Amino acid sequence: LAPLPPHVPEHLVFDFDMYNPSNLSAGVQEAWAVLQESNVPDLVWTRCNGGHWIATRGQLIREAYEDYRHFSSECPFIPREAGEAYDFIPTSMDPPEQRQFRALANQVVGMPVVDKLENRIQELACSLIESLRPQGQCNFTEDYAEPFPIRIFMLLAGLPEEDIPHLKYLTDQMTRPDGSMTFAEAKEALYDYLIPIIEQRRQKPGTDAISIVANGQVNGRPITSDEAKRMCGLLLVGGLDTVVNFLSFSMEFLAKSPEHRQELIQRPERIPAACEELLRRFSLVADGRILTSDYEFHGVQLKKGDQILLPQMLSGLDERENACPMHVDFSRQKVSHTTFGHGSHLXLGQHLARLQIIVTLKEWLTRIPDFSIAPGAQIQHKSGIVSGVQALPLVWDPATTKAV
Numbered sequence: 001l002a003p004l005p006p007h008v009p010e011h012l013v014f015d016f017d018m019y020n021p022s023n024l025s026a027g028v029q030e031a032w033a034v035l036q037e038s039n040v041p042d043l044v045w046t047r048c049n050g051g052h053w054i055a056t057r058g059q060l061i062r063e064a065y066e067d068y069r070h071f072s073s074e075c076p077f078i079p080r081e082a083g084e085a086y087d088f089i090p091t092s093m094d095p096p097e098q099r100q101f102r103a104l105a106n107q108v109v110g111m112p113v114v115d116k117l118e119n120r121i122q123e124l125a126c127s128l129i130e131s132l133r134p135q136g137q138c139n140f141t142e143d144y145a146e147p148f149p150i151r152i153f154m155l156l157a158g159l160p161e162e163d164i165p166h167l168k169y170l171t172d173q174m175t176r177p178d179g180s181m182t183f184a185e186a187k188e189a190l191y192d193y194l195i196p197i198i199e200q201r202r203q204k205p206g207t208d209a210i211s212i213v214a215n216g217q218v219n220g221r222p223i224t225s226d227e228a229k230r231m232c233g234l235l236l237v238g239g240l241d242t243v244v245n246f247l248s249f250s251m252e253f254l255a256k257s258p259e260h261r262q263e264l265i266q267r268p269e270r271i272p273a274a275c276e277e278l279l280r281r282f283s284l285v286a287d288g289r290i291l292t293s294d295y296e297f298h299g300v301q302l303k304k305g306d307q308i309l310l311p312q313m314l315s316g317l318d319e320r321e322n323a324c325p326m327h328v329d330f331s332r333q334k335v336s337h338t339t340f341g342h343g344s345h346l347x348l349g350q351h352l353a354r355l356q357i358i359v360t361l362k363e364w365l366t367r368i369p370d371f372s373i374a375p376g377a378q379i380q381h382k383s384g385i386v387s388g389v390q391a392l393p394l395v396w397d398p399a400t401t402k403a404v
């Protein structure tokens with residue numbers, strides 16, 4: 001625990017560790033939801049991870065994400081050393097500067113590319129699941145959650161599949177560090193990978209995502225090599241470490257919930273709505289902002305330079321935004337969440353993520369409608385900037401399956 005700064009009142013101290021929260025055994029979202037128990041204030045200070053604010057309620061999380069003048073994304077990760085090294089584009093930038101970079105990123109992961117990749121995405125989901133179906137078991141994280149989004153991203157980026165273990169290791173270290181590497185080290189290694197590739201593709205422009213970024217324009221002027229690297233780095237982290245984790249949370253839930261599975265099997269038109277309700281309940285991102293000036297916010301004196309965690313995961317779990325928030329209800333009339341962010345940094349990869357999730361649900365449930373967690377398995381989770389499932393052993397009776 002970092003020494004309590006003079007400016008922080010002892011009564012607001014709640015020593016939440018975002019990389020190892022107390023009640024993790026009960027599930028990731030459950031462990032973060034302790035921040036929203038009756039007794040806990042809306043804004044707390046933890047002495048963990050060098051010390052930082054945490055907004056615990058949807059209203060404050062939304063407000064701070066909108067007010068980029070006070071809450072800057074220049075230093076968006078805890079611990080401070082990570083936030084300081086963090087320079088990815090567009091996320092490390094505030095408007096006005098930030099927006100011009102979004103359009104270039106959209107050229108590579110936005111709707112028109114999703115429309116282009118839909119065939120390959122569909123084919124891969126089907127191929128992987130058909131492969132597993134007769135086995136009556138899988139390790140879902142390694143057999144599907146990882147390869148399905150990652151092989152598609154590597155194709156899009158024009159990178160060889162043999163590079164996956166190296167790149168996934170690095171992206172993991174930036175989001176759920178195992179202790180072997182600092183954020184700054186992991187970021188620099190990712191940049192080290194990209195530098196020669198960007199140089200090659202600026203000389204011989206191709207069709208892949210790296211070529212597109214590296215040869216692109218922002219607000220009508222050429223992107224620099226440095227800028228391209230800083231955006232390509234971010235795209236790799238998004239591609240390798242977002243949906244990959246989310247799919248495992250969703251599948252863990254469905255493995256324990258045969259009535260929910262049945263609902264989507266009998267009424268497939270519900271699958272898009274169910275996707276949204278799983279995105280709310282199994283929300284998994286928590287980053288934040290840095291104070292640009294001394295600022296009083298909801299009766300708390302925040303100091304210039306203070307870091308504030310603004311967990312995107314908490315907004316939709318807040319009872320003030322959604323009644324019985326820990327309940328998954330596919331008929332929920334108003335699904336309120338900030339799972340994909342809020343304000344000007346709203347996720348640009350959401351068309352891709354939603355497609356990947358919906359395709360998974362549809363293709364899995366049509367072939368393997370009935371499955372469970374392996375008997376005696378205790379599912380371990382890991383918390384971080386993006387939370388994850390360590391392993392998800394699934395089992396089913398092949399006699400309940402059907403080949404398409």
Ligand code: HEM
Pocket residue numbers: 073076089090091092098102105109234235236237238239242243246284285287288312338339340341342344345346347348349350352353
């Ligand atoms: C379930 C899957 C995903 C979730 C929950 C998610 C969540 C988020 C969140 C919360 C933000 C805002 C970060 C902030 O304000 O500091 C964000 C931004 C971003 N995401 Fe996603 N993301 C997902 C998938 C993806 C994918 C597949 C990509 C493709 C590379 C991607 C690329 C990006 C980029 C480039 C930004 C930065 C936009 C900006 O800063 O202007 N994300 N995402």
Ligand SMILES: CC1(C)[C@@H]2CC[C@@]1(C)C(=O)C2
Pocket residue numbers: 088091175234237238242285287385386
């Ligand atoms: C918080 C994010 C999910 C968003 C895209 C990848 C990620 C870890 C970032 O650094 C910005």
Ligand SMILES: [K+]
Pocket residue numbers: 074075076083084085086087092
């Ligand atoms: K920084």
